[PDB]
Amino acid sequence: NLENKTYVIMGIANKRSIAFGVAKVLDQLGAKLVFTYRKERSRKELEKLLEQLNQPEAHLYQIDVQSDEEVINGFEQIGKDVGNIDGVYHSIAFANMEDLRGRFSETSREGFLLAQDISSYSLTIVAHEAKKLMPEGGSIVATTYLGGEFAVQNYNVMGVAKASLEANVKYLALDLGPDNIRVNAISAGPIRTLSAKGVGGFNTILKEIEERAPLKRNVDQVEVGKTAAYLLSDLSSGVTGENIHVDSGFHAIK
Amino acid sequence: NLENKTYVIMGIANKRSIAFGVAKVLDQLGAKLVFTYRKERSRKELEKLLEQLNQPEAHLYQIDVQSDEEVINGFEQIGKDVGNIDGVYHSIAFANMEDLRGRFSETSREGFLLAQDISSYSLTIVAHEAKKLMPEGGSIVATTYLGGEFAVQNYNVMGVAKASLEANVKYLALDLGPDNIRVNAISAGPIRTLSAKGVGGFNTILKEIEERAPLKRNVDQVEVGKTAAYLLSDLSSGVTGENIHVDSGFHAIK
Amino acid sequence: NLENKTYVIMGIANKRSIAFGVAKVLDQLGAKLVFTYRKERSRKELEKLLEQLNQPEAHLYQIDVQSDEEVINGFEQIGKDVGNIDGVYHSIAFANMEDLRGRFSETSREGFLLAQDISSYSLTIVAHEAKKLMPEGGSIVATTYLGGEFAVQNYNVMGVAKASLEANVKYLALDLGPDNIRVNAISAGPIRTLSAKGVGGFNTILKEIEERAPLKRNVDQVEVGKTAAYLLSDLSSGVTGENIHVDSGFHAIK
Amino acid sequence: NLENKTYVIMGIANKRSIAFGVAKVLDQLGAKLVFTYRKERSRKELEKLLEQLNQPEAHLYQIDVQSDEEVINGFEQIGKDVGNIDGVYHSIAFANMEDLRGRFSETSREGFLLAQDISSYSLTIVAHEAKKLMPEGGSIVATTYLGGEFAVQNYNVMGVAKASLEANVKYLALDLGPDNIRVNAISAGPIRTLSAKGVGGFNTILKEIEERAPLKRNVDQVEVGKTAAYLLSDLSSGVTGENIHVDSGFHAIK
Ligand SMILES: NC(=O)c1ccc[n+]([C@@H]2O[C@H](COP(=O)([O-])OP(=O)(O)OC[C@H]3O[C@@H](n4cnc5c(N)ncnc54)[C@H](OP(=O)(O)O)[C@@H]3O)[C@@H](O)[C@H]2O)c1
Ligand SMILES: NC(=O)c1ccc[n+]([C@@H]2O[C@H](COP(=O)([O-])OP(=O)(O)OC[C@H]3O[C@@H](n4cnc5c(N)ncnc54)[C@H](OP(=O)(O)O)[C@@H]3O)[C@@H](O)[C@H]2O)c1
Ligand SMILES: NC(=O)c1ccc[n+]([C@@H]2O[C@H](COP(=O)([O-])OP(=O)(O)OC[C@H]3O[C@@H](n4cnc5c(N)ncnc54)[C@H](OP(=O)(O)O)[C@@H]3O)[C@@H](O)[C@H]2O)c1
Ligand SMILES: NC(=O)c1ccc[n+]([C@@H]2O[C@H](COP(=O)([O-])OP(=O)(O)OC[C@H]3O[C@@H](n4cnc5c(N)ncnc54)[C@H](OP(=O)(O)O)[C@@H]3O)[C@@H](O)[C@H]2O)c1
Ligand SMILES: CCc1cc(O)c(Oc2ccc([N+](=O)[O-])cc2Cl)cc1F
Ligand SMILES: CCc1cc(O)c(Oc2ccc([N+](=O)[O-])cc2Cl)cc1F
Ligand SMILES: CCc1cc(O)c(Oc2ccc([N+](=O)[O-])cc2Cl)cc1F
Ligand SMILES: CCc1cc(O)c(Oc2ccc([N+](=O)[O-])cc2Cl)cc1F
Ligand SMILES: N[C@@H](CCC(=O)O)C(=O)O
Ligand SMILES: N[C@@H](CCC(=O)O)C(=O)O
Ligand SMILES: N[C@@H](CCC(=O)O)C(=O)O
């Protein structure tokens, strides 16, 4: 039960976003949610989707995580509008198709670094600014994938950005631990989202989960949200620096 | 929210058992609990500890996991008495002191296999029998420690039994996944229990968590309990084959 | 260059055995070799295979690793016959077909412990006895499979026994390290051997390596033997408690 | 024996460099070596160092890996001067001292992207340019540290860059495996080098290996060079996507 709790959810674009699975769940557990977005199109989609939520106010902030000022100022504005928060859910990542859809060895410098910037470094600077609204401690959760841990066909530069994200979680864990800020990741299974369209062979990835994963079925966004609720709440008070695979068991097999 | 759920908890000896932290947690969440014990002295503690629970009936079964017949019969009687169950918490391990307290390379054959039998194999046969009471699916959780993944000073033969246990979890996950039974581990941080007195150096293991783990404190039985509730509930539906470290972040650092 | 080195190689059964690939390599590199076997039939193969090698003397010993007396007297005879040694290549596993070719949850207690005994515990007692003949230090290597790190269909009880072995290596590396005894594993890809016939679906496992492993081919016994030469020699002087995958890269992908 | 082999060694700074240990070993084994260096003002010192080797001529190229042009043009010149190569030892990394010595949460975007640039991305562009000189296959090795697998105090931004590097190696291995190019990492224990002065608490780190690693000693640059010889030669055919810890076993303990 997350009554009197407040969470910042970053990275909803539409109803299929993993972040929206998080939000339906936290919303049904009673949490007050605040939302961040990059594109105005996503804000419009948040205004719509909010009609399905209990949230009695829209708290929507534009934060492009590529800009120090937008992050610095977004979170500072949040602290002034709703006060102290209990956690962040980070569900942001990006890489160019042009790098994604070529040989990994052909990845461009700017594409590699763009993927690092949005997909990894964004969590560090969000943590630093969000720390400022958690004087009592809290919980930060980032969304990753099995491609950070193993080379997965066609995931390429985003795989290296995920490996980077996952180490980011650990180093943030050790750093903000003494402040009672826990930092963790959910390694979600593949899930048809707007961004899934960027991954070559994604239909064959889906199929292979069903055929080979222990539960012999794919996961959904609500399943990610149910584990986010665990990590973002007191239930997981002794868990930081961890990576939970919400993935039907597929991480455990070969 | 486990009203109308039933969980079999194996391995309570006294008030400081990890499994008793699992029990107070699931008891407060509204679960019906069934307890298994080995020694008569443990059943005596269980009858006492039940007075602190909300459980309106004592369901207590002697099950020494060295005995196929006792596991087989124990569980069949559980099903005759309370019907189908939603899960099992496994909190059972054993090795001889004489093996634990010598050089690992001096470990006896009989003591090595003893520690495999009670501390690993017992999971497999418990799953097999518990599966008969979970026709519609469920959740099995075992307790491990970090010495199953890395060589920890003085954990010796139990280290290899926990490596085995952790592989047992994954192979059980892949085998019983199709029946909608999930199987996971909790890697608990060090916690003062009756069995902790078996581990050479345990006070220095304690202190080292506090000074080096991200959270700079040790965990307790309730914290393991809260992660058990998550794992034993529908909040962790897409999660199987997993190993959650309830250990203040210690697994993540070096 | 391994002239004036002596290595004990355990577990050749015929020309296909992984250990005979190791032998050919160590033999081509100049090492003196001592062989142990279980079955009469394997001693006859050894006698025949020795004509293909450069060894001027045949040093063959019957050691059934289920017997402490055979391991203890085996290595002691070895000391009397050839003197101090530089290392041991261990290449021994067994599980019942009846357990392997059924569901893992259905594994018998005696089959599980049988598999631990031959396939894991054997390394501990071998290390203890070989250590007596390595007063200046040396190197011990064991043969593992990826299914000790992940659940692989049909590997079943042997996957739990390899998980046990792999931990065994790490605890022994720690225990014996001050004695300048290094202990490592090689995780070999699937290879056609007499024992590969016990694992259901082997050919499917072969094909999937060709299809999906980075090198898009299978490895062979000589490739394992060349990595053994590295681990058994001074080239690997800083390396212990390690698991080297000689599997065309299959361990790094998913 | 590496006669009629040619290797490019990137990252010799002085006689304490891990890349110079690599050079000594490979030089001793009869390889032709080519050296790359960052700044023209330290060509004269590198030339003096290499008088120690049995190289008949200096093959020295200035390549700063922050520039694609320098990498592209450097490897093209090497091809014209020397012909086809058999592999590359990558020993390059960099982070700001100013990001190294703060809270990891306080890392600047510029400093976090620079470390990724020099310490991870450089491997990718190097492999792409070196692959042009390895039409029949070959071997690429990069140097990482345990800090990329766990959070290590004071390693901060470099730890996340090594996590990146380590995934880089996995993705490169999958990409390039069909070309018969293998890509691996050596994870070196702590070694007193020019760059080690930049890590806070280095001697404490030394002392900890001495005290806690299985071998109870530190490793040296020549021990890295010997694992490098194995990884760069045919002894390691079948090994790719791998991370060999040359660290006295410290990685396997906790
Ligand atoms: N779908 C899967 O199978 C899968 C699996 C595992 C992990 N994940 C991870 O889950 C997370 C979310 O992806 P998803 O599948 O839910 O896709 P999604 O619905 O497309 O969401 C991705 C979000 O990233 C945001 N974003 C990108 N760059 C940004 C920037 N510079 N500043 C602010 N926001 C930015 C997008 O916002 P705008 O549209 O407003 O630009 C969008 O809301 C990512 O971390 C992804 O890697 C996905
Ligand atoms: N305490 C820690 O720091 C720690 C840390 C990580 C993981 N763990 C793990 O947590 C679990 C629980 O142990 P604990 O530390 O809570 O100690 P505990 O209170 O001493 O419980 C150990 C339990 O194991 C039971 N057991 C031993 N052999 C058995 C058998 N043959 N049949 C049935 N039960 C048997 C004992 O029952 P009887 O007394 O009736 O014989 C006792 O209930 C173990 O798996 C342990 O390895 C503990
Ligand atoms: N083939 C693969 O795909 C593969 C892959 C990864 C790992 N491995 C591992 O590689 C090792 C060798 O297997 P292999 O494939 O080379 O098959 P193999 O030729 O059939 O050799 C297995 C050996 O185990 C010996 N052995 C079994 N029980 C023994 C006992 N109780 N005492 C002494 N020796 C005993 C057998 O000796 P006797 O015949 O005399 O009884 C036989 O020589 C094993 O550890 C295996 O698990 C194999
Ligand atoms: N020392 C250790 O304990 C240790 C442990 C594990 C891993 N490692 C790794 O081993 C590798 C070598 O480090 P080291 O300890 O040998 O230190 P080092 O001798 O100082 O070598 C680092 C080298 O990287 C070069 N470099 C930095 N930026 C470059 C650039 N932009 N372009 C081309 N070269 C560049 C440096 O060149 P300049 O001198 O001209 O600036 C220097 O030659 C690094 O990857 C390091 O992370 C070191
Ligand atoms: C394969 C499962 C999977 C993993 C993901 O990280 C994923 O998310 C993204 C992938 C690529 C981009 N991009 O190109 O900007 C963006 C995102 Cl948010 C989607 C997935 F379907
Ligand atoms: C080091 C943290 C820790 C890990 C454990 O597995 C643990 O449990 C046991 C240890 C030894 C035995 N035995 O010898 O019978 C039994 C158990 Cl239940 C206690 C711990 F203190
Ligand atoms: C799948 C790759 C693979 C891994 C192995 O461990 C392997 O070795 C054995 C497998 C089964 C038994 N047995 O049942 O007695 C014995 C051995 Cl020696 C063979 C393999 F083909
Ligand atoms: C602590 C072990 C250790 C790991 C390393 O990667 C290492 O190398 C570097 C560290 C920092 C920088 N820098 O800030 O530019 C550069 C390098 Cl080359 C040295 C080490 F002493
Ligand atoms: N191969 C096509 C289709 C992928 C799919 O199977 O979903 C692509 O790269 O998008
Ligand atoms: N070293 C003592 C005491 C351990 C402790 O509690 O610190 C022992 O072997 O039990
Ligand atoms: N699947 C058959 C054939 C084995 C193989 O495919 O190699 C079996 O159970 O043995």
Side-chain angles (χ1 to χ4, degrees):
Chain A
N1 172 271
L2 314 174
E3 287 165 18
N4 296 31
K5 298 302 214 228
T6 301
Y7 299 108
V8 175
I9 301 162
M10 312 184 75
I12 301 186
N14 54 51
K15 77 183 169 50
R16 276 177 151 207
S17 283
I18 284 168
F20 191 54
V22 165
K24 283 190 274 185
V25 181
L26 297 175
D27 181 63
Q28 164 94 13
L29 295 172
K32 164 155 32 79
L33 312 170
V34 159
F35 298 93
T36 77
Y37 62 89
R38 172 172 64 163
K39 278 168 218 303
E40 286 271 27
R41 181 59 176 92
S42 301
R43 163 200 259 274
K44 269 146 205 294
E45 204 71 10
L46 285 165
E47 288 159 0
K48 189 209 267 159
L49 286 164
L50 278 167
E51 297 162 319
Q52 283 171 44
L53 266 33
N54 298 329
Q55 295 314 289
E57 280 159 295
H59 301 300
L60 311 179
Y61 304 72
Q62 181 162 57
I63 299 178
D64 185 338
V65 304
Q66 289 203 275
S67 163
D68 298 336
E69 299 294 288
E70 292 195 24
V71 183
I72 293 166
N73 290 336
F75 270 91
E76 160 175 281
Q77 193 53 41
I78 292 164
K80 301 195 301 151
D81 302 345
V82 317
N84 293 337
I85 57 155
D86 301 272
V88 193
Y89 189 83
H90 178 285
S91 193
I92 291 171
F94 188 85
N96 296 316
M97 290 294 251
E98 294 89 340
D99 297 299
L100 271 179
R101 302 299 197 111
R103 295 186 76 168
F104 178 65
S105 69
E106 294 164 347
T107 312
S108 71
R109 197 186 299 271
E110 80 171 4
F112 176 108
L113 288 163
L114 171 71
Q116 293 285 335
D117 194 29
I118 292 170
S119 306
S120 186
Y121 173 74
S122 62
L123 186 79
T124 308
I125 190 191
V126 168
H128 185 261
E129 302 307 318
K131 196 218 191 225
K132 282 175 208 194
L133 316 171
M134 304 169 286
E136 224 88 302
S139 180
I140 306 179
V141 171
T143 309
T144 187
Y145 176 66
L146 177 83
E149 302 174 69
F150 301 93
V152 164
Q153 199 64 251
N154 296 315
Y155 198 62
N156 292 335
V157 64
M158 185 62 89
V160 183
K162 296 307 184 162
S164 168
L165 179 76
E166 285 166 48
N168 213 331
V169 169
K170 289 165 213 210
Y171 271 91
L172 283 173
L174 168 60
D175 193 18
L176 305 171
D179 290 315
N180 194 40
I181 292 168
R182 296 182 291 107
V183 195
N184 290 285
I186 310 190
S187 192
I191 305 175
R192 314 178 163 287
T193 61
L194 189 46
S195 286
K197 282 154 217 302
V199 176
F202 175 96
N203 291 321
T204 60
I205 302 158
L206 270 188
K207 173 168 76 203
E208 168 152 275
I209 307 289
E210 265 193 288
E211 295 194 288
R212 297 189 79 236
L215 305 179
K216 305 264 168 308
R217 77 172 177 65
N218 283 286
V219 293
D220 76 16
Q221 298 92 331
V222 156
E223 278 176 305
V224 171
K226 294 187 304 184
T227 288
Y230 158 72
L231 287 176
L232 291 163
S233 84
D234 171 62
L235 269 195
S236 66
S237 59
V239 177
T240 181
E242 176 69 271
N243 185 1
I244 308 180
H245 291 80
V246 180
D247 77 338
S248 278
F250 178 73
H251 69 279
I253 74 131
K254 248 302 211 172
Chain B
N1 332 145
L2 294 342
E3 269 167 48
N4 306 318
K5 302 291 173 181
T6 303
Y7 294 113
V8 177
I9 299 191
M10 309 178 83
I12 294 175
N14 54 54
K15 63 172 190 189
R16 311 155 116 206
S17 292
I18 285 176
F20 190 60
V22 173
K24 304 190 274 172
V25 171
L26 303 177
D27 180 71
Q28 208 80 24
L29 288 179
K32 182 184 305 175
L33 308 168
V34 162
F35 302 94
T36 72
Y37 61 90
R38 177 171 57 167
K39 322 251 213 290
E40 283 298 322
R41 175 76 218 253
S42 297
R43 177 199 177 93
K44 277 175 87 284
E45 283 316 286
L46 265 165
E47 297 165 352
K48 173 171 37 163
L49 298 173
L50 277 188
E51 270 142 4
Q52 290 164 39
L53 304 182
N54 305 149
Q55 290 308 293
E57 259 203 78
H59 302 293
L60 316 177
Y61 304 79
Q62 194 164 32
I63 302 185
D64 185 328
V65 307
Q66 293 196 275
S67 168
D68 291 349
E69 269 326 285
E70 294 194 20
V71 181
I72 288 156
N73 289 0
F75 275 89
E76 177 185 28
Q77 193 60 56
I78 291 178
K80 285 198 250 196
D81 298 343
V82 311
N84 297 336
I85 61 165
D86 305 276
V88 185
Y89 192 88
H90 186 283
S91 198
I92 284 166
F94 192 84
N96 300 318
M97 291 280 269
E98 21 287 285
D99 295 313
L100 270 177
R101 308 308 206 103
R103 301 188 63 171
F104 172 68
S105 54
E106 296 174 339
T107 303
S108 62
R109 186 186 312 264
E110 100 190 353
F112 183 102
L113 294 175
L114 179 57
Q116 302 280 330
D117 194 36
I118 287 170
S119 304
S120 183
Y121 177 69
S122 60
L123 192 66
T124 304
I125 191 191
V126 159
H128 182 257
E129 298 308 302
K131 163 189 201 272
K132 300 177 196 174
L133 312 178
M134 304 184 293
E136 238 184 302
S139 182
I140 302 171
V141 182
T143 312
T144 193
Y145 171 77
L146 170 76
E149 311 161 76
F150 300 92
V152 174
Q153 214 66 233
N154 304 328
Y155 201 59
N156 295 330
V157 60
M158 188 54 62
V160 180
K162 299 298 197 187
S164 167
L165 175 77
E166 282 162 48
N168 216 321
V169 167
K170 301 181 213 194
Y171 279 93
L172 290 174
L174 167 64
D175 180 27
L176 303 171
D179 302 318
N180 196 40
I181 290 161
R182 305 185 276 99
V183 190
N184 294 279
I186 312 191
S187 196
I191 299 175
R192 206 179 287 293
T193 60
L194 199 39
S195 298
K197 313 194 143 74
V199 184
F202 180 93
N203 291 325
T204 67
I205 295 178
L206 271 187
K207 179 181 69 221
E208 164 162 62
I209 305 301
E210 293 182 41
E211 41 216 51
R212 277 148 80 137
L215 308 178
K216 272 104 191 79
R217 58 157 188 95
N218 289 289
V219 297
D220 69 2
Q221 304 95 321
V222 158
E223 285 181 301
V224 170
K226 293 181 289 166
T227 294
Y230 157 73
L231 285 175
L232 293 160
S233 79
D234 170 66
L235 274 187
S236 67
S237 51
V239 176
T240 184
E242 180 57 282
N243 181 14
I244 305 168
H245 289 96
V246 178
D247 67 346
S248 281
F250 188 74
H251 62 287
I253 71 137
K254 251 278 187 188
Chain C
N1 182 346
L2 305 179
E3 290 183 328
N4 298 300
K5 309 266 159 239
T6 300
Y7 300 102
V8 176
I9 292 181
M10 319 183 61
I12 300 176
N14 50 68
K15 77 192 181 213
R16 287 136 87 219
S17 299
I18 295 170
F20 183 66
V22 173
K24 287 186 280 180
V25 177
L26 297 182
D27 181 75
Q28 194 53 43
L29 289 177
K32 181 184 307 167
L33 301 171
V34 160
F35 299 94
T36 77
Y37 62 86
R38 171 172 65 158
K39 293 186 153 79
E40 189 203 307
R41 176 60 213 263
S42 294
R43 175 199 109 245
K44 270 122 162 59
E45 278 302 288
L46 271 163
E47 294 172 355
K48 164 169 86 178
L49 293 169
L50 268 288
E51 284 157 318
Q52 286 162 44
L53 306 175
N54 306 122
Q55 304 293 303
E57 270 175 286
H59 311 290
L60 315 166
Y61 302 79
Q62 195 169 47
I63 296 180
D64 188 333
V65 298
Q66 295 209 264
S67 175
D68 285 359
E69 299 84 348
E70 290 194 20
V71 179
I72 296 169
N73 295 330
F75 276 85
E76 185 189 40
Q77 254 321 127
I78 290 174
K80 294 162 148 31
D81 293 357
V82 308
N84 285 335
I85 65 175
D86 301 281
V88 181
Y89 191 83
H90 175 291
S91 201
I92 288 164
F94 182 84
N96 296 322
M97 283 304 273
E98 292 85 342
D99 286 310
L100 282 182
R101 309 297 199 119
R103 300 192 66 166
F104 176 69
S105 61
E106 276 165 14
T107 307
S108 66
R109 188 182 302 269
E110 59 167 49
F112 179 98
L113 292 169
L114 181 69
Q116 290 291 324
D117 189 38
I118 295 178
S119 320
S120 182
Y121 181 70
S122 61
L123 180 71
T124 312
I125 175 90
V126 163
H128 189 260
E129 300 310 304
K131 174 185 202 260
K132 288 169 191 175
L133 311 174
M134 306 186 283
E136 251 94 40
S139 178
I140 295 168
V141 183
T143 316
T144 193
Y145 184 51
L146 189 75
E149 307 165 71
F150 298 89
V152 159
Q153 296 264 9
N154 303 333
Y155 207 53
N156 292 352
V157 69
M158 187 69 72
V160 183
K162 300 305 202 178
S164 176
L165 173 69
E166 277 170 37
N168 212 321
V169 170
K170 297 164 176 178
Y171 283 92
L172 286 176
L174 174 58
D175 186 24
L176 296 183
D179 295 312
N180 205 31
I181 298 157
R182 293 187 299 98
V183 193
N184 294 286
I186 302 173
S187 185
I191 296 163
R192 295 200 179 280
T193 68
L194 189 71
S195 290
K197 269 83 149 74
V199 164
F202 190 75
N203 285 344
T204 305
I205 299 177
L206 272 183
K207 195 158 51 170
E208 171 172 45
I209 303 311
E210 292 164 33
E211 278 174 28
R212 292 193 63 238
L215 303 180
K216 311 278 184 244
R217 54 164 188 95
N218 282 289
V219 294
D220 62 27
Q221 300 92 330
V222 167
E223 293 187 288
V224 171
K226 293 181 290 186
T227 291
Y230 156 71
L231 293 169
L232 286 161
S233 81
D234 184 63
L235 276 191
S236 58
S237 64
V239 179
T240 201
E242 183 63 284
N243 187 358
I244 303 171
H245 295 83
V246 181
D247 67 354
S248 290
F250 191 66
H251 77 275
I253 74 80
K254 191 74 184 100
Chain D
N1 178 262
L2 302 168
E3 269 159 53
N4 298 305
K5 307 260 152 196
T6 305
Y7 298 106
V8 180
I9 298 168
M10 317 181 74
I12 298 171
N14 55 35
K15 74 186 176 174
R16 300 189 187 288
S17 295
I18 293 170
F20 188 55
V22 174
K24 282 182 310 194
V25 169
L26 293 192
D27 179 62
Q28 197 132 25
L29 286 176
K32 181 183 307 175
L33 300 174
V34 165
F35 307 87
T36 76
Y37 60 91
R38 154 147 82 157
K39 15 176 92 111
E40 184 62 19
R41 70 159 168 178
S42 55
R43 182 197 187 93
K44 70 187 134 192
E45 212 255 57
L46 205 65
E47 296 250 51
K48 254 268 158 128
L49 246 198
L50 315 165
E51 273 175 38
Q52 303 188 4
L53 308 179
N54 320 108
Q55 296 295 291
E57 59 190 320
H59 296 304
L60 297 149
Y61 299 90
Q62 173 223 95
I63 296 184
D64 177 328
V65 297
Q66 284 212 274
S67 163
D68 293 355
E69 269 191 50
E70 299 203 3
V71 187
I72 291 151
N73 289 334
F75 276 83
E76 167 173 52
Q77 198 50 233
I78 288 165
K80 307 214 239 229
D81 294 352
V82 126
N84 286 338
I85 71 173
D86 294 283
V88 176
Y89 193 84
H90 188 282
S91 206
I92 290 172
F94 186 83
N96 288 330
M97 307 290 259
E98 349 291 66
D99 302 306
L100 258 170
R101 320 293 206 96
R103 305 188 63 176
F104 172 70
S105 51
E106 304 169 326
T107 313
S108 65
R109 190 180 304 264
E110 295 62 34
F112 174 111
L113 292 178
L114 174 75
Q116 291 286 327
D117 196 22
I118 298 171
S119 323
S120 184
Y121 181 72
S122 76
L123 185 64
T124 312
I125 180 86
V126 167
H128 187 265
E129 298 311 299
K131 163 178 176 335
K132 290 181 205 183
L133 293 179
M134 304 183 299
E136 292 159 282
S139 175
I140 300 165
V141 188
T143 319
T144 190
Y145 176 60
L146 194 65
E149 307 170 70
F150 306 87
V152 167
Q153 217 78 68
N154 291 319
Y155 200 52
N156 299 0
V157 58
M158 193 64 86
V160 183
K162 296 303 190 171
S164 173
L165 177 68
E166 277 163 34
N168 213 320
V169 173
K170 302 189 242 200
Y171 280 91
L172 288 164
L174 178 65
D175 187 20
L176 296 181
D179 294 307
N180 206 19
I181 300 159
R182 305 179 289 107
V183 194
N184 296 288
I186 298 169
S187 189
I191 296 172
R192 165 121 39 217
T193 71
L194 177 64
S195 287
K197 316 186 200 194
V199 181
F202 187 79
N203 287 343
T204 289
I205 303 175
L206 285 190
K207 186 188 181 160
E208 167 134 290
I209 299 313
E210 261 179 47
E211 292 190 359
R212 308 208 82 247
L215 301 197
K216 314 279 192 254
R217 68 180 176 85
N218 289 285
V219 294
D220 66 16
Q221 299 93 328
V222 169
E223 296 185 288
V224 177
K226 285 134 107 216
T227 289
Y230 158 73
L231 284 177
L232 293 165
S233 70
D234 172 76
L235 272 191
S236 54
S237 76
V239 175
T240 198
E242 189 55 292
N243 184 2
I244 300 179
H245 300 77
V246 178
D247 73 348
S248 284
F250 191 63
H251 78 279
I253 70 83
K254 226 187 134 28

